[PDB]
Amino acid sequence: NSVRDAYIADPHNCVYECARNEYCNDLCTKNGAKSGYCQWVGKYGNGCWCIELPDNVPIRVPGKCH
Secondary structure, eight states: EEEEEBBBBBBTSBOOOOOOOHHHHHHHHHHOOOOEEEEEESEEEEEEEEEEEETTTBBBSSOOOO
């Protein structure tokens, strides 16, 4: 599939930390996702979670934030 639900990440495989759900919805949607929210708890801790983020945009994958 061309889209997936996951933590959006930067080119260094680092999540985008968040303080507001709105920050994440904006960040996610401007990058092509349908919506987004802030996770204060999750597989990789605090960070923005995006719904249906296109695969030309990075997501947090196993490994370290480098």
